[PDB]
Each structure stands twice: as C-alpha cells, then as structure tokens.
Specification:
One of its GO terms (cellular component) is perinuclear region of cytoplasm. With about 250 residues, the protein is α+β, with helices and mostly antiparallel strands. It has two domains: about 160 residues, Orthogonal Bundle (Transferase(Phosphotransferase), domain 1), CATH 1.10.510; about 90 residues, Phosphorylase Kinase, domain 1 (2-Layer Sandwich), CATH 3.30.200. Helices cover about 30% and strands about 10% of the residues. Helix 4 packs antiparallel against helix 6 and helix 6 packs antiparallel against helix 8. The structure holds adenosine.
C-alpha cells in the first residue's frame, strides 16, 4: 500500500508513539483507521523488536471479537497500521459513562471476550493486555480486543500474581485477567484497586477482594472461580461460557 491510497479523517485518538486518524481507502470508499507509529519513538525504545511480532500475529488473527489488522506499510520516518474501525469507542469510556454495566451486557461481554480468547489459545497466542482500555466496540455494541503499542495503579490492577511476582505464567492468565474484568464490570472499579502499588500486590497476590451488597451470587462464584492464586486451579475456557451465569443473561 501507500499513504496516498487513503483519505485521512479526524484523529480518533492521540498517541505518544504515533496517531490514528479516521481513514478511507480511495478505491473502496471504505472506512478505516490508520494506527501510524513514529519512528524516533519505535526507536527511542527497543520496540522495533516488539513490533512485527504482534504485527504478524494480529495480521492473521481473524475473529469477530478481535479487531482485525487488514494491512501495514511504512515510509521513511513513520509506519502505518491499517485496521478494523470500531465506531462505538472504548468500553472503558462506555464503562465510565454508565458507572457499571448490568448483567446481560457484562456477562455477554465476558463470553464474547472469552471466545475471542478461545480462538486465540487454540492458535496458541496468549494475549495479556486486556482491560477496558484495550477493548473496543463495534456496530452492534459488540466487543473487539486491540493489543498493540500506543501511548491509578491501573498499571498493576490487572496483572495476575504469577507475573507481578515475576514468576512463570502461561495460558492460565487470560482467565485471571478475565476475572477482574467481569468484576470491574459489575462493580465500576477493579477488584484490586487501592491507593498504593504496594497496597495492591498485597491484595492481588494475597488475592484480597470483597463484594458489594448486590452483585448476584452467581457472579460471586463465577468470579471467585476466575481469580485464584494457583493458575492451574482456574477454569479453562469452556467452563465460563458454560457457567450458570454466562448462559441466561448473555447474547
Ligand atoms: N479501530 C478503532 N476503532 C475505534 N476507535 C479506535 C480505533 N483505533 C483507535 N481508536 C481510538 O483511538 C484512540 C487512540 O488509540 C483510542 O483510545 C480509541 O478511542
């Protein structure tokens, strides 16, 4: 491709590294989104290596609930990412507007996500980023994950013990990362949010989390079944999809 192959639109967002204005291939008159990343930035931080990788990975990653990555090119100074356009914005935002999601929307979201993760695990790719910020919304309020470069302990809030503890972790993490989310969904905030980075592992690794006077108990267990110190003690994919909670409020 070529930067001339498309018509640029307003800036969808911002980025320390690069930008990403609305786009449109001039042929298809088709709407897009071009995540252009700078050089100097992909260079000011050994990440040229961190690129190509995900690049080649999403660059195949064909799933509804996985923001597709049509193509990529790159000129002297910069590089460009040609990707699926997600109109309804970020769940984070959606999540900061309605305070907390209901049960249909949050359970359903979780099952959407799960499968996106299934097709992932199958094709052996353990994501690791997922949280409101790296999850987008399509035409039908459908979900889309987008794990790439870009620009409140939120940093840790999401990580699983096995990692913040520097230990070894594998596939079993996407389940933990899947617990939190479902929680922050039904609540408004993560389950391990606390003032200091310190006062957090304390709650994360120690797995110190409480429920508000209302969350269904069917959650209270689907979740307690999604967050556990022991990575091998957690439900594999199926289970949630097959959990008494997903099914029912969902889809
Ligand atoms: N494909 C996309 N669909 C919708 N919004 C997007 C897309 N890519 C990036 N954005 C927006 O651009 C911002 C910067 O990446 C994000 O916070 C998000 O709002």
């Amino acid at each position: 491709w070529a930067l001339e192959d498309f018509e640029i639109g307003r800036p969808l967002g911002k980025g320390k590294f690069g930008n990403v204005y609305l786009a449109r291939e001039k042929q298809s008159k088709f709407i897009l989104a071009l995540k252009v990343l700078f050089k100097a930035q992909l260079e000011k931080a050994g990440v040229e290596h961190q690129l190509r990788r995900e690049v080649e990975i999403q660059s195949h990653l064909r799933h509804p609930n996985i923001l597709r990555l049509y193509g990529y090119f790159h000129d002297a100074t910069r590089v460009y990412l040609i990707l699926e356009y997600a109109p309804l914005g970020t769940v984070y935002r959606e999540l900061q507007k309605l305070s907390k999601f209901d049960e249909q929307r949050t359970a359903t979201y979780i099952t959407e996500l799960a499968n996106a993760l299934s097709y992932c695990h199958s094709k052996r790719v353990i994501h690791r980023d997922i949280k409101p910020e790296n999850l987008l919304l399509g035409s039908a309020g459908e979900l889309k994950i987008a794990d790439f470069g870009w620009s409140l302990c939120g940093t840790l809030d999401y990580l699983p013990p096995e990692m913040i503890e520097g230990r070894m972790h594998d596939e079993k993490v996407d389940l933990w990362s899947l617990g939190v989310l479902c929680y922050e969904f039904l609540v408004g905030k993560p389950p391990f949010e606390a003032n200091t980075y310190q006062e957090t592992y304390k709650r994360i690794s120690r797995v110190e989390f409480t429920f508000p006077d209302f969350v269904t108990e069917g959650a209270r267990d689907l979740i307690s079944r999604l967050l556990k110190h022991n990575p091998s003690q957690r439900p594999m994919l199926r289970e949630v999809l097959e959990h008494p909670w997903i099914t029912a409020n969902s889809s």
